[PDB]
Amino acid sequence: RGTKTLHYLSMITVNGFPGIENTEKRHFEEPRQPLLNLEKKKTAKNILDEQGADAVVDYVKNTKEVLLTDTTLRDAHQSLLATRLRLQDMKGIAQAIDQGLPELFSAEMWGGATFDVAYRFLNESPWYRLRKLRKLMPNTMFQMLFRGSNAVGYQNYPDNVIEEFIRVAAHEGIDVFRIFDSLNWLPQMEKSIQAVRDNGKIAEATICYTGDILDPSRPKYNIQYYKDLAKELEATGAHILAVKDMAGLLKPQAAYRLISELKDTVDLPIHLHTHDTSGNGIITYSGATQAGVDIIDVATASLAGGTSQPSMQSIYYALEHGPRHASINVKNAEQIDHYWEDVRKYYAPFEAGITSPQTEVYMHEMPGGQYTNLKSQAAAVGLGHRFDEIKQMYRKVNMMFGDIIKVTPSSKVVGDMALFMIQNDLTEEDVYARGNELNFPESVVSFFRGDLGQPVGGFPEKLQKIIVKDKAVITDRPGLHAEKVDFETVKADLEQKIGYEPGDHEVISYIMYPQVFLDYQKMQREFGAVTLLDTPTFLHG
């Protein structure tokens, strides 16, 4: 253990940290520990543990105030710090979050990019992070972002694999599963919702908001589409209806109209998740609060704004004297935000830069992760000076594909198409004419084969035959055609590859990420548990 520790320390000291500029270690002060005025309240986690998920739904329904879900541990640092927030910085404040903020509905700490990024770059197990945070926060519900068909991975998986992931995640401490589909397709979400219900946890059926319901020029995603989707999601038996605004597209008037119209439609509580990219996140949450939204997704102030969530303290002060107040202790929240600012000072190499509110997201509708990835891709191929034209081409490609819902991985399809069109100097007419000779990117080909599912209204028929030439096109769930996985065989093979008997979580991690888990195990054998190091020492040695 010690030998591995000085091995990692010497490696980082001499060769630097991979992916960041080699820089001498700055001296940091100790992060400020909060002074909390503690109150003992019965949280939603106590209700879930004692009386179940339906009692949690009843408690949310009977709460006149708007509940808050803290996205600091997942989405705030996914948007701002490239998901690089380490478990050490979280566990410095996890107990303070659990005790000083018992009014929180849940804390989003898992799913999304965290599962892959922790293994690949932070060299720490996300299961280990979940276990440590669960021990430190016994009275906080743990929210996770769950893709309905692929769980946290990106490959095609059978239904039993997704069910096993749900069972193991619920056993290890995930309480709320925010289940979403990239194309808002119900069959991808139905089985995951049913498995979350069978494990006794809270299933959040999620609608991804795209376009503008108040714009009649785009009637594909109008209020009737969202009402029908909410009715279908209510039919699945999900406890809470969720509305994901991945790019901050929901305008406050549209927010009020959408939340009200969903409110007379279904009786589920409504959870709204938005980003502050346009700078309108606070007023969007306020307009949803007047319409009667139940839970909204907020982040701590030092990790809020920009591509991240709206601030929890600011949304408290925005609704302080209105008809509905935010359910939070704002003094404890500010005391915690002091620590979060101090530890955000550690992650200077991963900062995006100077950030201003951008209303161009109303035009290209790119999520912040897709925005950063496409900017880096354009910089790599020598087209970084044409990023405005790349964004225009992104909007045009989204319209060409039939106005699809753009989130991971469907936003990557549009980004790859836009980059390929900019690279080869192609217009819409050029693709419709010379697309037979063209070799489209594999993500676009996989999307038009049906590997991502079926989009709303189907594919454009001519563009589909242009993009996929002789490859087979499926019209049903790709998980039905997934190659069968036997957990005993995978467990035995993993016991051969790594030098010990794996747990259920390790087998399920090997199934989601085969090469990434093996690389993590090799780095664990070489460098040990580097998660115990502090972040300046972890990055600079």
Residue type at 181 in one-letter notation: D
Residue type at 388 in one-letter notation: D
What is the closest distance, in whole angstroms, from the C-beta atom of residue 282 to Mg ion in the complex? Answer: 19
Stretch touching Mn ion by CB under 5 A, among 67-75, 135-143, 217-225, 228-236: 67-75
Helix H or strand E segment including 324: none
Q: Which residue is nearest to Mn ion (CB)?
A: 75
Q: Which is nearer to Mg ion, 63 or 194 (CB)?
A: 63
What is the closest distance, in whole angstroms, from the C-beta atom of residue 75 to Mn ion in the complex? Answer: 4
- Taking alpha carbons only, the member of 202, 189, 176 closest to residue 108 is 176
Q: Which of Mn ion, Mg ion, none does residue 212 bind (CB under 5 to 8 Å by kind)?
A: none
What is the closest distance, in whole angstroms, from the C-beta atom of residue 206 to Mg ion in the complex? Answer: 18
Count of CB atoms situated within 10 Å of the CB of 522: 11
What is the Cα–Cα distance from 170 to 143, expressed in whole angstroms? 10
Residues 6+ apart with CB under 8 A from 40: 102
- Restricting to residues 62-101, name those near Mg ion by CB under 5 A: 63
Q: Which is nearer to Mg ion, 57 or 122 (CB)?
A: 57
What is the closest distance, in whole angstroms, from the C-beta atom of residue 79 to Mn ion in the complex? Answer: 7
- Restricting to residues 256-315, name those near Mg ion by CB under 5 A: 294
Helices (H), 109-150: 114-117, 126-136
What is the SS3 assignment for 217? coil
Residues 6+ apart with CB under 8 A from 224: none
What is the Cα–Cα distance from 367 to 40, expressed in whole angstroms? 38
Stretch touching Mg ion by CB under 5 A, among 61-69, 222-230, 374-382, 433-441: 61-69
Q: Which of Mn ion, Mg ion, none does residue 75 bind (CB under 5 to 8 Å by kind)?
A: Mn ion
The encoded tokens of residue 3 equal 């030998």
Q: Which is nearer to Mg ion, 63 or 537 (CB)?
A: 63
Q: Which is nearer to Mn ion, 75 or 506 (CB)?
A: 75
Q: What values do phi and psi take at 497, rounded to 5?
A: -75, -45
What is the Cα–Cα distance from 397 to 413, expressed in whole angstroms? 10
- Taking alpha carbons only, the member of 439, 455, 513, 532 closest to residue 184 is 455
Q: Which one of 47, 72, 75, 92 is in contact with Mn ion (CB under 5 A)?
A: 75
What is the closest distance, in whole angstroms, from the C-beta atom of residue 406 to Mn ion in the complex? Answer: 13
Q: How many residues bind Mg ion (CB under 5 A)?
A: 2
Q: Which of Mg ion, Mn ion, none does residue 63 bind (CB under 5 to 8 Å by kind)?
A: Mg ion
What is the closest distance, in whole angstroms, from the C-beta atom of residue 137 to Mg ion in the complex? Answer: 23
What is the Cα–Cα distance from 399 to 414, expressed in whole angstroms? 10
The encoded tokens of residue 443 equal 């993500």
Q: Which is nearer to Mg ion, 324 or 395 (CB)?
A: 324
Q: How many residues bind Mn ion (CB under 5 A)?
A: 1
What is the closest distance, in whole angstroms, from the C-beta atom of residue 112 to Mn ion in the complex? Answer: 7
Binding positions for Mn ion, rule: CB under 5 A = 75
Binding positions for Mg ion, rule: CB under 5 A = 63, 294
